[PDB]
């Protein structure tokens, strides 16, 4: 049973101490899902106004 | 890089006697072209320069917290007052001399102290040169990595932009004489590449399908084409080719 998850990869990742600002950002990251990296429509990438105070507007990978 | 998204490579190491010295004896250690501001609008670097120069001058430590300086209380007003209180000028410009001609430049320059980070991407980790070396053994082409020697991929976009020049022989060189180039020989009558077979040692390739050895002729053909003919035979398809 997939554990009621919907994702079966990228569940754990390497935490790299290149800097202490790369390391501290692995324990505050939130991944919408690894399957959404393959989608024609871009609507799970919209920065809605309901993530005010819960997700940072600026801190998102830029590719 | 700076703390404002202004990344750039190091292009020169300017001698210390050719740098424009200021009227205070100083000499910058970073030269930053003023044309990254107009299109990128990083006005925070121009404020960090003045804040850091005021800090180094007064022994202080200013905060760059967002949303602490309004339209009424501006940041430029604050830090220009700090500078003017140290004998420098409000707008943060000190006038330099030319370290090459020795003359006071006509424009007064904007100098300050900013915090630079050094990025982990170095030319020492991203540079490759291949002449000859390893090869993929299925296609007999360069291997394709940097830790392994590895060749750079030409690409279909590049193949389609190189034959818009009309240079068919640059294309021949790149795609044929550099990547893969073999001498697979064919039976001319049967016109088949799989049919010629060597003998047991006067070593004459003899065609298996028709037993003649006067009909075999060598053809210069890529290696992936012979792989393609083999994998087609695997499917019972036949590639009959007309030799001239």
């Amino acid at each position: 049973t997939g554990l009621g998850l919907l994702q079966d990869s990228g569940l754990c990742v390497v935490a790299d101490k290149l800097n202490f600002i790369r390391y501290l950002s692995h324990f505050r990251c939130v991944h919408r899902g690894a399957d959404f990296a393959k989608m024609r429509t871009t609507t799970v990438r919209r920065l809605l106004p309901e993530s005010w105070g819960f997700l940072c507007p600026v801190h998102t990978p830029d590719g | 890089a700076s703390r404002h998204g202004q990344k750039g490579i190091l292009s020169r190491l300017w001698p210390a006697e050719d740098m424009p010295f200021t009227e205070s004896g100083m000499v910058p250690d970073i030269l930053f072209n003023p044309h990254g501001f107009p299109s990128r609008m990083t006005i925070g670097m121009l404020i960090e320069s003045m804040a850091g120069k005021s800090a180094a001058l007064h022994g202080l430590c200013h905060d760059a917290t967002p949303f602490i300086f309004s339209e009424e209380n501006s940041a430029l007003e604050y830090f220009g007052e700090m500078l003017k209180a140290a004998g420098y000028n409000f707008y943060g410009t000190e006038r330099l001399y030319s370290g090459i001609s020795g003359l006071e430049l006509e424009a007064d320059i904007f100098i300050g102290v900013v915090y630079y980070q050094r990025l982990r991407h170095m030319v020492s980790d991203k540079f490759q040169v291949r002449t000859t070396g390893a090869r993929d053994r299925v296609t007999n082409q360069p291997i394709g990595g940097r830790n392994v020697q590895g060749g750079i991929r030409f690409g279909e976009m590049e193949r389609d932009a190189l034959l818009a020049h009309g240079t068919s022989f640059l294309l021949h060189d790149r795609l044929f004489n550099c990547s893969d180039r073999s001498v697979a020989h064919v039976c001319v009558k049967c016109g088949s590449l799989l049919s010629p077979l060597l003998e047991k040692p006067n070593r004459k390739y003899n065609c298996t399908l028709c037993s003649r050895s006067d009909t075999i002729d060598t053809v210069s053909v890529p290696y992936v084409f012979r792989y393609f003919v083999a994998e087609l035979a695997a499917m019972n398809i036949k590639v009959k080719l007309d030799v001239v």
Binding site: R40, W52, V58 | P38, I43, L46, G92, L96, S98, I100, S101, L103, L105, A107, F110, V123, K126, F127, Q128, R130, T131, T132, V138, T139, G151, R153, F154, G155, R159, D160, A161, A164, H165, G166, T167, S168, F169, H172, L175, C178, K200, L209, D217, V219, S220, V221, P222, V224, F225, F228, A230, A233, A234, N236, I237, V239, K240, D242, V243, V244
Partner: protein, 1473 residues
């Protein structure tokens, strides 16, 4: 010594299965292929007779090692027959339509014989014979058709070689596809009426004949063997002499072991995916061979035999196509996946090989190496080696290289021997390298692999290669101690390099014949102009623009010593004296001007023999930028006669103008563009280099450029107005929203919030966008009010002395939208063209009340980057900046595919030696490239308005290029006489649409006849009483051979380019160029008269000059213009209101060629007559759709007796613009709605388990359910109906049905038109124009209004509807105009010569064909068409048809290792003996 033998053709067929034998070294039988330790197990897949897989062993079949042995083929012999997976589906059809009893196809022999004969004629190329045979048949079987077909095939043989052309492959494709699609369905058998032994195949590996037996491949094989016998004459043509045996497999072929390399997978050290599929087949073969022996030692046993058969068949399927079988696991990818995909084998290792002798490194700015050079960092130079052959005139410098060694720079890593090879010098003893420095010149000479030697040619590429200029050749300037490749900044825009970590590749030609082409063709100065629109590409950037604009300004004076040392530092001259100037000011102190520095730098660069150029143009910096102080008026002075806005170079000496980006830049017609025209591309590169050096020395020595905070600051007393305007802007929300909801003008302050909420939670959501738009307009008015207060004159420092202005204003960097948004306003945020979205509760951000009217709550940012933006504004700005990046990614993802498709179809179109644009198979696409020839980059100065430049610089242009030699070796009589004839004709016929004719010309007696002659008759045969007199007088009562009304009515001579071969025929130019030349000669002979200068040029020398300059701009034969058109449509898109925009529209037009477009439209002008204007109001009101649902108030349904009262709307508010009447509307319910209602009731109930009187009666005459409706003698007062189904029906809220039906029920509408509208004005020149635009498409339903509207000038964006009402030559121009209007919305402008070629190719064969995967089916190249997409379907096709390939495409020429048939390879060299 190469093989010397070349390939002419490649055909794909099927192997016999008996000739594969003898193509086999041994049969493999051992399943376990991996030995206990990892070596080859004998008789397994990896064997030593199938070749040495690795260099360790030698093959048993031929003694020879790896890297020298061509591998051998082997065969897993199968226990029993299996169907082949590729020829399988066809087999199914060959069994579906057939009588298993009779063994004959169920098709009428008419179709069989017709198609047989059509194929017989197609095999030779005859293409009219197809329809001729079909019509011969229909008018009439074998003897009737075979006579004609044999006559064709005999009289039209010698055409088997000229049959592999498009238009001959499309016909065969269509014929065979229609056959397989329409005539192979199961049918009752002709001869025996009961021969439908229905084969019906389940998933692959399963065919089941009924009386539900399982078809065994042996029974199916025998059926095919006995069906071929009866129907072979026909199928040998549908399949090529195909034997039916090929449809079945009795063995599987194991490919040579060198092509199957053991790698590793989880928990397995040595495994190839292909051997794991073949091992599964071998394992099933072994289990099956056991059951057969069990039968021999003898329902479960045979049920098991039939189950293991199906399993073995899915194992042989997977071996061919991993995903043919979906119910098996341990399935590694088959051959369809080895060949067909982006990973694949064609798009990788076939079109995208990896290359040797190439480097890649980060690029760095240089600027002190010439524009045609690359800096190599002594680490590539010591590794990159060129193989130079040793000869008497180089053996000296080669000797120093072998002595210098492998590691010193002018050295060499190796020397190849005459017969032997590869004696490496890399030793560092320095004595054996000297021992071998001799014996050079001691057959093919020794070749020294020398290093890069500071003059070599290198091809440089940046990886998103979107245009021809992304690969250019450079001249190897070697630099010591670096690992970066240094490149000039003029070559940046060409590559899009940005020096922020920008790795770039450098390729090193190794042939001495690719060096000639890198020097001549791919050079980086032949690449000055972009091929998209001919405008310059190389130019100076950034501080070379602010330096040159501040030095060439009027008040810059230099002493002798700053004048010098500024000239010599730009020149760095190497030969000959420096020609200096004279001081402009000679007296109080000798002083120069800065324009004099540029002048004296310009007269030294221009080649010694040639003479300096004259040039007149405009500067980028407007002459209004300098107006500090209000301008006053002087009576006789035109301020622009003496302005810094007009650039005037007179004999190489700048006399006026600033010389900003408009010159030195990427703008056309500047100083460097004219230098490149008159003196060539090397002189323009020299000018660029020297000007860069000069403008750097200026800023580095005497001046300086910076950007502080006192040039972005804003004056006080100007921020007070900004603050008051921002305060005023905080009160404009209520009015905006209210007046957009058309609410009561005032008195509602909470009804507006509720209306906004309703519009927000609505379903359609187009009354919400209305509010968004009418709110953005208010905010934009306020934003524009604020910019004017601060930006022009509210800045503390102005343009001459502001550093931000003078950087955006001279084209250095940035725009005026950046200068603002740094000062005085950030603007209105817009995400999807709309304001930021609201939450689910009606608030846009947690800080804002729900449904807040202030513009601040909708993303109107009044803060600037000078004084930062608050948190809420920060949020919206981040939303916008993030959507930008998302859109970038997705846009590029789509553009790449569009461009790949385009380039894969238009790649083989090259200009031929007869100036005609032909494809690979010879199909004429165009008879003249741009419709006139004249490749784009050379036609830049042939425009008018550029003749006064060619006239001024005439002496330089004739000496430098054409010379007196060509002008007098020209003979223009043939073409000049043709134009005289054309001019005379057009003189005798001013109106060229007046129906010229001989007999028509003999209607001038019209009065002679109408007077008295024809007064007595009737319409004898329908013509007239008076027309018969004219017919009689003309017919035979006129002279025999002197009735020459013909000459007065003859056609215009055909255009000169058509008859007189523009290349070899002087003065044969286009009809639009000669008109321009006439106009300019007439406007130039009337300027010389009042010129106070002496002109030594005559109108008839200027004419010859222009004619030569035309004849020479003529698209060299071999140009390959289709690839240029592809790349020119691609690059602009890849980079970059009720219609579609962007790549969606381009893909609709080019890639899909759809008949259904999202936004179809029309536009007919209105005829400009008083009656037409009045009738149009009614016309607009006549074509809009009125639907039952648009006219209804509410239904009242009572319920098995279901009543229904419609209660229609009053006419006050819907008859105004719908043209409806209540009797028509109600009559509609009686005849259409009240019966579609019973239609839907049955739709549900089929799968559930005095005058009022006649109308009611006829209505219930037709239906048995209704009882009686109503009548409304007063404006539809109460109009109900009653139904009843009394026995048993599903009584639910049927209102659902009668509401889902009362929406798609439309009273009446023109088919296809959804609404019209008259956009009042469309012109300023003749503003009087009116246009009746539409949002649907029905061309014929407008033909009835040829008096209200202009039906010529009718336009639509459909291109399939135009192609059906007006033809294909009319759809070509719609295609071209659509592409042009798509590119126009972004300012992009592709040259018309590219869209002409694209539209001519798309509409080549009579239909609007898409430029996509289904357009390549009509293509004569199997090797192409499989390098694009669906490579396995296109291979199966080419294989079951015996399709032959001629190796004439670029793809087929790069697959078999040939030289492409365009550009440099288009001719031989034929050394004479």
């Amino acid at each position: 010594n190469m093989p010397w033998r070349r390939l002419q053709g490649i055909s794909f067929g099927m192997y016999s299965a008996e000739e594969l034998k003898k193509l086999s070294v041994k049969s493999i039988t051992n399943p376990r292929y991996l030995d206990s330790l990892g070596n080859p197990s004998a008789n397994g897949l990896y064997d030593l007779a199938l070749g040495p897989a690795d260099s360790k062993e030698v093959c048993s079949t031929c003694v020879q090692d790896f890297s020298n042995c061509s591998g051998h083929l082997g065969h897993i012999e199968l226990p029993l027959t299996v169907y082949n997976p590729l020829l399988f589906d066809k087999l199914y059809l060959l069994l579906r339509g057939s009588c298993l009893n009779c063994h004959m196809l169920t098709c009428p022999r008419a179709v069989i014989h017709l198609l047989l004969c059509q194929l017989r004629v197609l095999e030779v190329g005859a293409l009219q014979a197809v329809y001729e045979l079909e019509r011969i048949l229909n008018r009439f079987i074998r003897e009737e058709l075979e006579q004609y077909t044999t006559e064709i095939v005999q009289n039209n043989l010698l055409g088997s070689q000229g049959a592999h052309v498009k238009n001959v492959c499309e016909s065969k494709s269509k014929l065979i596809a229609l056959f397989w699609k329409a005539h192979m369905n199961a049918k009752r058998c002709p001869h025996c009426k009961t021969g439908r032994s229905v084969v019906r195949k389940e998933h692959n590996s399963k065919l089941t004949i009924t009386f539900r037996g399982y078809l065994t491949p042996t029974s199916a094989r025998e059926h095919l063997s006995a069906l071929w016998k009866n129907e072979g004459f026909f199928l040998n043509y549908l399949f090529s002499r195909f034997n039916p045996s090929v449809f079945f497999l009795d063995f599987l072929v194991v490919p040579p072991s060198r092509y199957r390399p053991v790698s590793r997978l989880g928990d397995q050290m040595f495994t190839n995916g292909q051997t794991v599929n073949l091992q599964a087949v071998m394992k099933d073969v072994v289990l099956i061979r056991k059951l057969l022996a069990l039968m021999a030692q003898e329902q479960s046993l045979i049920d098991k035999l039939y189950n293991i058969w199906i399993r073995l068949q899915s194992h042989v399927n997977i071996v061919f196509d991993s995903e043919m079988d979906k119910l098996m696991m341990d399935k590694y990818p088959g051959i369809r996946q080895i060949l067909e995909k982006k990973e694949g084998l064609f798009r990788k290792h076939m079109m995208g090989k990896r290359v040797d002798y190439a480097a890649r490194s980060v690029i760095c700015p240089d600027m002190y190496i010439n524009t045609n050079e690359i800096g190599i960092p002594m680490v590539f130079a010591t590794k990159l080696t060129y193989p130079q052959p040793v000869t008497p005139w180089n053996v000296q410098e080669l000797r120093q290289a072998v002595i210098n060694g492998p590691n010193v720079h002018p050295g060499a890593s190796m020397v190849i021997n005459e017969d032997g090879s590869r004696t490496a010098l890399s030793a560092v003893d320095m004595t054996q390298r000297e021992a071998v420095a001799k014996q050079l010149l001691t057959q093919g000479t020794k070749i020294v692999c020398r290093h890069v030697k500071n003059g070599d040619i290198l091809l440089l590429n940046r990886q998103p290669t979107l245009h021809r200029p992304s690969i250019q050749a450079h001249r190897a300037r070697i630099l010591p101690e670096e690992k970066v490749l240094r490149l000039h900044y003029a070559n940046c825009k060409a590559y899009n390099a940005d020096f922020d970590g920008d790795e770039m590749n450098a390729h090193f030609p190794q042939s001495e014949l690719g060096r000639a082409e890198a020097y001549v063709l791919a050079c980086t100065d032949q690449q000055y102009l972009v091929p998209k629109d001919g405008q310059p590409l190389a130019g100076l950037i950034q501080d070379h623009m602010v330096s040159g604009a501040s030095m060439t300004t009027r008040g810059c004076f230099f002493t002798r010593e700053h004048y010098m040392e500024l000239v010599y530092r730009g020149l760095t001259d190497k030969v000959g004296r420096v020609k200096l100037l004279s001081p402009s000011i000679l007296k109080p102190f000798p002083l120069w001007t800065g324009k004099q520095v540029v002048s004296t730098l310009l007269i030294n660069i221009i080649p010694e023999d040639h003479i300096p150029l004259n040039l007149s143009g405009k500067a980028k910096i407007t002459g209004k930028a300098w107006v500090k102080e209000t301008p006053r008026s002087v009576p006789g002075f035109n301020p622009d006669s003496m302005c810094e806005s007009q650039v005037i170079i007179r004999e190489g000496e700048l006399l006026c103008g600033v010389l900003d980006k408009a010159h030195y830049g990427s703008s056309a017609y500047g100083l460097v563009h004219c230098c490149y025209e008159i003196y060539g591309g090397e002189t323009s590169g020299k000018v660029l280099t020297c000007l860069a050096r000069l403008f750097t020395a200026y800023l580095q020595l005497y001046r300086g450029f910076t950007l502080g905070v006192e040039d972005i600051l804003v004056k006080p007393k100007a921020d007070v107005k900004r603050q008051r305007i921002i305060e005023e802007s905080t009160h404009c929300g209520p009015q905006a929203v209210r007046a957009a909801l058309n609410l009561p003008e005032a008195a509602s302050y909470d009804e507006v919030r509720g209306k906004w909420q309703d519009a927000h939670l609505g379903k359609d959501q187009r009354d919400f966008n209305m509010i968004d738009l009418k709110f953005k307009e208010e905010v934009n008015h306020y934003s524009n009010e604020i910019n004017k207060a601060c930006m022009p004159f509210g800045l503390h420092r102005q343009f001459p002395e502001n550093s931000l202005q003078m950087m955006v204003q001279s084209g250095a960097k940035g725009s005026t939208v950046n200068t603002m948004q740094i000062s005085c306003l950030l603007g209105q945020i817009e995400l999807e063209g709309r304001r930021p979205p609201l939450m689910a509760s009606g608030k846009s951000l947690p800080c804002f009340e729900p449904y807040e009217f202030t513009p601040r709550a909708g993303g109107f940012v009044t803060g600037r980057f000078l004084t930062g933006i608050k948190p809420p504004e920060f949020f919206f700005h981040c939303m916008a900046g993030r959507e930008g990046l998302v859109d970038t990614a997705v846009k590029t993802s789509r553009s790449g595919y569009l461009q790949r498709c385009i380039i894969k179809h238009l790649e083989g179109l090259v200009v031929q030696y007869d100036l005609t644009v032909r494809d690979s198979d010879g199909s004429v696409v165009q008879f003249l490239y741009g419709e006139d020839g004249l490749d784009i980059p050379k036609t830049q100065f042939l425009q008018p308005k550029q003749f006064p430049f060619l006239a001024s610089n005439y002496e330089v242009i004739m000496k430098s290029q054409h010379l007196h030699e060509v002008l007098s070796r020209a003979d223009p009589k043939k073409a000049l006489h043709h134009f005289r004839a054309i001019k005379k004709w057009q003189s005798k016929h001013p109106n060229t649409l007046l129906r010229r004719g001989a007999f028509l010309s003999y209607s001038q007696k019209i009065q002679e006849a109408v007077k008295a002659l024809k007064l007595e008759s009737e319409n004898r045969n329908g013509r007239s009483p008076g027309t018969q007199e004219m017919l009689r007088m003309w017919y035979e009562l006129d002279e025999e051979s002197r009735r020459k009304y013909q000459k007065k009515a003859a056609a215009c001579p055909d255009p000169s380019l058509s008859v007189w071969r523009p290349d070899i025929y002087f003065a044969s130019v286009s009809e639009t160029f000669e008109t321009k030349v006439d106009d300019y000669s007439q406007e130039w002979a009337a300027q010389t008269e009042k010129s106070y200068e002496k002109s030594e040029l005559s109108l008839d020398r200027l004419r010859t000059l222009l004619q030569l300059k035309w004849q020479r701009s003529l698209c060299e034969p071999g140009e390959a213009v289709g690839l240029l058109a592809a790349q020119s449509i691609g690059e602009p898109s890849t980079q970059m209101m009720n219609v579609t925009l962007g790549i969606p529209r381009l893909r609709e037009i080019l890639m899909v060629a759809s008949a259904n477009i999202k936004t179809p439209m029309m536009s007919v002008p209105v005829l400009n007559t008083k009656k037409a204007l009045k009738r149009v109001k009614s016309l607009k009101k006549q074509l809009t759709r009125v639907c039952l649902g648009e006219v209804l108030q509410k239904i009242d349904v009572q319920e098995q007796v279901y009543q229904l009262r419609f209660q229609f709307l009053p006419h006050a508010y819907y008859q105004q613009e719908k043209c409806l009447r209540p009797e028509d509307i109600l009559r509609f319910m009686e005849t259409r709605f009240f019966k579609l209602l019973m239609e839907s009731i049955k739709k549900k109930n089929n799968k559930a388990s005095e005058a009022m009187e006649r109308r009611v009666q006829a209505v219930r005459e037709i239906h048995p359910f209704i009882d009686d409706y109503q009548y409304d003698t007063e404006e539809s007062l109460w109009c109900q109906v009653t139904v009843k189904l009394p026995l048993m029906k599903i009584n639910f809220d049927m209102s659902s049905l009668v509401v889902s039906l009362a929406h798609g029920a439309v009273i009446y509408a023109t088919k296809g038109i959804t609404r019209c509208l008259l956009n009042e004005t469309t012109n300023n020149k003749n503003e009087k124009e009116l246009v009746l635009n539409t949002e649907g498409i029905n061309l014929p339903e407008l033909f009835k209004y040829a008096e209200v509207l202009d039906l010529r000038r009718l336009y639509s964006n459909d291109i399939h509807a135009i192609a059906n009402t007006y033809g294909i030559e009319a759809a070509l121009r719609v295609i071209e105009k659509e592409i042009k209007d798509v590119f126009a919305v972004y300012g992009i402008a592709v040259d018309p010569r590219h869209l002409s070629l694209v539209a001519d190719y798309m509409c080549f064969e009579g239909v609007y064909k898409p430029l996509n995967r289904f357009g390549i089916r009509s293509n004569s190249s199997p090797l192409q068409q499989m390098t694009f997409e669906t490579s396995f379907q296109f291979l199966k096709q080419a294989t079951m048809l015996g399709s032959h390939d001629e190796l004439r495409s670029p793809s087929a020429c790069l697959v078999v290792g040939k030289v492409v048939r365009g550009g440099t390879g288009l001719f031989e060299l034929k050394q004479p003996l």
